[PDB]
Design a protein around this ligand. Structure first.
Ligand SMILES: [Mg+2]
Ligand SMILES: [Mg+2]
Ligand SMILES: [Mg+2]
Lengths: 117, 252, 88, 106, 65, 52
RNA sequence: GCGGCCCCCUGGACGAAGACUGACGCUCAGGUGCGAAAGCGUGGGGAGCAAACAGGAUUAGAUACCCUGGUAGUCCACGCCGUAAACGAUGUCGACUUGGAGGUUGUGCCCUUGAGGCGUGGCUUCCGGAGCUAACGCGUUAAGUCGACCGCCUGGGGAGUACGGCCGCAAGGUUAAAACUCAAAUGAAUUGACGGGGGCGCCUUGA
């Protein structure tokens, strides 16, 4: 059993799913949760509620590893950003850096074709 | 989906079929009573598959027809025509009309039974029929017409205007007949080699066969077979295609 | 597309004086020198069609000027094409 | 001849040989009978993002009027000399002698 | 407009990071000319300058780098 | 520094960055003719307001 | 058609102010060359994307629409093809003929400077007068007023199809009929339907 505290939190949100993972300052994963592992499937898997629940599951995993400090970064286009990070405010940490780190290309390679719908 | 409407061409099709006893006849897709009746009439008794169980009830309860046919109610692509050929004493005459998404499957299932089928007689859309009979050097030619002409001799019976159909389509369509060769004029070591040679070639039909079949064979193999590798895939007869198939199979 | 000094050498050769520019002789000479130079460009830059559109304009402009001078005075024409070696 | 700006940056841990670099390149300029109108250093200076995983690298400017040939020599000398981590050469309109804003801030 | 036109009339610029900072987002993107009030001539010069300044890590490309 | 005020500050920053609108529209390729048509369509759809 | 940045070579354009040549001009059948996208030829490359294909779904069926894959292709050098709603659906060149609000890029003079304010080329956008136009509209960047030459059309289908020639590696390109068949075919614009509405019996289009 290991106790450390310096914490980086990554929110990886998409219109199918939201993964959340906690890492050390090194970026080394301490533990993680998703929505789909929270148990929701199809439509429920991508909901602000499922993203809160995923954050609660990570909050439990870090209670075992580290809880004093966190630096939270957010990625992917999906819903529930606010919902999952306010769920990190549950068992609240002292955090101040927020931006997205959503990948924007400087005119990178050809995206998929549009859906015929 | 479609079925025919006008007695002139119904009568032309059922008469051109020449359906009589001394033939192991089976309908598929009996559809509207009007075109299944004359064939169930002229044959003293007739076998049939309908895919639909509700239409199979409509026709099996019809006293013209239920007493005069034996009737089956399933996807014909499940159906064991090789056993029906045994039960009918001689290889089958298989015939009719359908919604024809299933058409491409029908041909392969019929070809899975080239021994058990004596002949096939079916309506189809103008472009696919003209493809099916297409001569090697034409844009209408290609892989499915190659496999068809490999398995059988193929013969247009007659051609029908779109106003002839109950829901009339925009599209003219023809009845065609075909004959599994009594011995294959093109003997082949395997058909999967044909199927993959033809798909590779026709997946690349604009480039030279050196840049199609020569992606697998050498130019010296091709010219060794007597084939110019600078041709395009749509210059090539089924004869040299089965020669390639034999070459692939026997040199592997 | 030429240095002022190569232009100066050419106009001081083919021109009436330093006040002359654009006498037919001056024109066809500097135009010829440019055409000669650009052979080195296109000998590398084969695919530079947009540049060679200017070259085609220049050789045809040269032809037009020569033919005008030829009908205006054969002596000036012949001694000028002699000096430039034109109709090569 | 063509005026140029030549502007380049040197590894913080090779910044001590920068005078030797100014010798090597200024000798190439005057050895081409070219002339120089600015030479400047802005010291070790922090980078907006990491260059070659480094920080704080040492910045240098020249204003010059050399014949084209030797600019390609010193340019390719930058790809030979790994102490130079980047360079940019600019075919500027004029010789310019007034100090860089990077100096004039002092 | 005319005050922003004076900013163009006075100067054409590269290496003046202090003035370049007047025309960038904090995320490092170029400001559109209508928001700067400057005329398009100077917008082009500023864009060219910013691109050079990014090449030499004088300005970032993004917020992060 | 209240968490939900730092959240509002963050929300303003990502709105000013436009990143959700960018990644939304960047989801697919497009045949350049249609954004050309859409662009000029918007240009006249705008210009019609200029008239009073 | 051309869009990160720098270099190297290189084409054209516009303004300034003179100077110079001395009608050297325009147009252009044949001819010659450039010519998107797709495809081909020869040899590389292959990240992402993706005809074909393959497999899972959906549907009365679904070949579609959905998804997981995926080859050619997409990229490069060097050949070819030579077509596109390659359309401003508007040939090239020259002269003339109300205005108005912008944009962009030179330039002159005045600047009290710095802003300004008088001018003055070039390019370009939108309004619109006269005139023109079947009407729609065009309108000093004409579809107005006219001069020179070139290209092209002569009812609708049959048919840009046949055949022949040419051209192309092949695709195909190109030039190009006729029989035969019909009393139309067609452009613009008007009024009802629209209709599914949409708002509030009434104005009127998520259709
Ligand atoms: Mg290729
Ligand atoms: Mg291509
Ligand atoms: Mg033709």
């Amino acid at each position: 059993r290991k106790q450390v505290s310096d914490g980086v939190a990554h929110i990886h949100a998409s219109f199918n799913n939201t993964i959340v993972t906690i890492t050390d300052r090194q970026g080394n994963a301490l533990g993680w949760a998703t929505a789909g592992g929270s148990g929701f499937r199809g439509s429920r898997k991508s909901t602000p509620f499922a993203a809160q629940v995923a954050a609660e599951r990570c909050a439990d995993a870090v209670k075992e590893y580290g809880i004093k400090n966190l630096e939270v970064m957010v990625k992917g286009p999906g819903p529930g950003r606010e919902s999952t990070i306010r769920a990190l405010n549950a068992a609240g940490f002292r955090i101040t850096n927020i931006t997205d780190v959503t990948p924007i290309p400087h005119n990178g390679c050809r995206p998929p074709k549009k859906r015929r719908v | 989906q479609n079925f025919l409407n006008d007695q002139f061409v119904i009568d032309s099709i059922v008469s051109a079929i020449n359906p009589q006893k001394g033939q192991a006849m089976v309908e598929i897709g009996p559809g509207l009573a009007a075109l299944t009746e004359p064939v169930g009439e002229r044959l003293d008794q007739l076998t049939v598959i309908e895919l639909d169980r509700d239409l199979a009830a409509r026709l099996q309860t019809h006293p013209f027809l239920g007493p005069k046919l034996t009737i089956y109610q399933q996807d014909a692509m499940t159906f064991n025509f090789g056993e029906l050929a045994e039960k009918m004493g001689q290889p089958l005459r298989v015939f009719g009309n359908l919604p024809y998404n299933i058409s491409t499957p029908l041909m392969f299932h019929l070809f899975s039974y080239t021994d058990a089928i004596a002949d096939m007689h079916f309506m189809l859309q103008k472009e696919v029929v003209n493809r099916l009979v297409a001569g090697p050097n034409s844009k209408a030619y290609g892989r499915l017409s190659v496999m068809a002409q490999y398995y059988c001799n193929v013969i247009p019976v007659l051609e029908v205007p779109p106003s002839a159909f109950t829901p009339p389509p925009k599209v003219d369509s023809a009845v065609v007949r075909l004959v599994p060769h009594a011995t294959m004029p093109h003997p082949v070591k395997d058909v999967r080699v044909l199927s993959r040679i033809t798909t590779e070639a026709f997946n690349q039909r604009r480039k030279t066969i050196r840049n199609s079949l020569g992606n697998l064979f050498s130019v010296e193999v091709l010219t060794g077979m007597g084939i110019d590798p600078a041709m395009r895939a749509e210059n090539i007869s089924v004869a040299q295609y089965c020669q390639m198939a034999n070459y692939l199979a026997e040199n592997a | 597309s030429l240095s002022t000094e190569a232009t100066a050498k050419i106009v001081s050769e083919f021109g009436r004086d330093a006040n002359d520019t654009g006498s037919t002789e001056v024109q066809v000479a500097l135009l010829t020198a440019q055409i000669n130079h650009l052979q080195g460009h296109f000998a590398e830059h084969k695919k530079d069609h947009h540049s060679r559109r200017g070259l085609l304009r220049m050789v045809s402009q040269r032809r037009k000027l020569l033919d005008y001078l030829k009908r205006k005075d054969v002596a000036r024409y012949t001694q000028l094409i002699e000096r430039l070696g034109l109709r090569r | 001849m063509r005026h140029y700006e030549i502007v380049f940056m040197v590894h913080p841990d090779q910044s001590e040989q920068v005078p030797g670099m100014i010798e090597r390149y200024t000798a190439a300029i005057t050895g081409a009978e070219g002339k120089i109108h600015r030479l400047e250093d802005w010291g070790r200076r922090q980078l907006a993002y990491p260059i070659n995983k480094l920080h704080k690298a040492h910045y240098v400017l020249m204003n010059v009027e050399a014949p084209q040939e030797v600019i390609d020599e010193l340019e390719t000398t930058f790809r030979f000399n790994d102490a130079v981590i980047r360079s940019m050469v600019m075919r500027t309109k004029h010789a310019v002698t007034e100090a860089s804003p990077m100096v004039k801030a002092k | 407009f005319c005050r922003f036109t004076a900013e163009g009339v006075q100067e054409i610029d590269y290496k003046d990071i202090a003035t370049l900072k007047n025309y960038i987002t904090e995320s490092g993107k170029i400001v559109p000319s209508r928001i700067t009030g400057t005329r398009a001539k100077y917008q082009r010069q500023l864009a060219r300058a910013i691109k050079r300044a990014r090449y030499l890590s004088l300005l970032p490309y993004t917020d992060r780098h | 520094e209240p968490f939900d005020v730092a959240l509002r500050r963050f929300k303003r920053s990502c709105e000013k960055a436009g990143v959700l609108a960018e990644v939304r529209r960047r989801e697919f390729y497009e045949k350049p003719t249609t954004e050309r048509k859409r662009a000029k369509a918007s240009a006249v759809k705008r210009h019609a307001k200029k008239l009073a």
